[PDB]
Amino acid sequence: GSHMEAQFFTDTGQHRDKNEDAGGIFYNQTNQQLLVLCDGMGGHKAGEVASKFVTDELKSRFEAENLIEQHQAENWLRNNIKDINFQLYHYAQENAEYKGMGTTCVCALVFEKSVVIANVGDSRAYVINSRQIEQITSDHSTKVMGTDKRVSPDLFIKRLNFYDYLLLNSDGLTDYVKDNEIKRLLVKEGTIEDHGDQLMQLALDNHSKDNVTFILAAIE
Numbered sequence: 001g002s003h004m005e006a007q008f009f010t011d012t013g014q015h016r017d018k019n020e021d022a023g024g025i026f027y028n029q030t031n032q033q034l035l036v037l038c039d040g041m042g043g044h045k046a047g048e049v050a051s052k053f054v055t056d057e058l059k060s061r062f063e064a065e066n067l068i069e070q071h072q073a074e075n076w077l078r079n080n081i082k083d084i085n086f087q088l089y090h091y092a093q094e095n096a097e098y099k100g101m102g103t104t105c106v107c108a109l110v111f112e113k114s115v116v117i118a119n120v121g122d123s124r125a126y127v128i129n130s131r132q133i134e135q136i137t138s139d140h141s142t143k144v145m146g147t148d149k150r151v152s153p154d155l156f157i158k159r160l161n162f163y164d165y166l167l168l169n170s171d172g173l174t175d176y177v178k179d180n181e182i183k184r185l186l187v188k189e190g191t192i193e194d195h196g197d198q199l200m201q202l203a204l205d206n207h208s209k210d211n212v213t214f215i216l217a218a219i220e
Ligand SMILES: [Mg+2]
Pocket: 020, 021, 039, 040, 041, 047, 211
């Protein structure tokens, strides 16, 4: 039943026709929480097919699980990301309008005092408090799911103590909003919707040329 107060935000942006970002907040049979964010691309403008494909697979597989304790989480994420990459790759190869499509994926399994994060691509995971903002993941840039039948995701475990927020985001945010801008926005008093709306408007005010998507989660 480990979960944070969290919300998913996305915007096509003022310089894009479609939204090829995807993601969500999902719950398994014991109401554990999984945060998922995907930045799609490629194919004949089929980026949204890839990002939604991975998001839907993670949701379906997670909702089918009973209990994933912290010591099982790295292997669960790693093996399921590998399997989803395999499925997406061959799906793309079997459809001429999809061939070449792929997507980033950053996702987080939530536990009591920790989070387990898997990452493929240049979407990001951050933890933030009043004095620092730490990018947990490392941009693979760009390796994405679905363009090869093999993938090697990075796995991270981060203790949530003494941090205030967990942030997952596509590059539409951090390509145009600096880390310190994000941290100083979050140090203010306000709800998740307060910070989420302000952070989206800030990305738009910086004239992001990309889809902008993020999950903001409050750490107790
Ligand atoms: Mg994209």
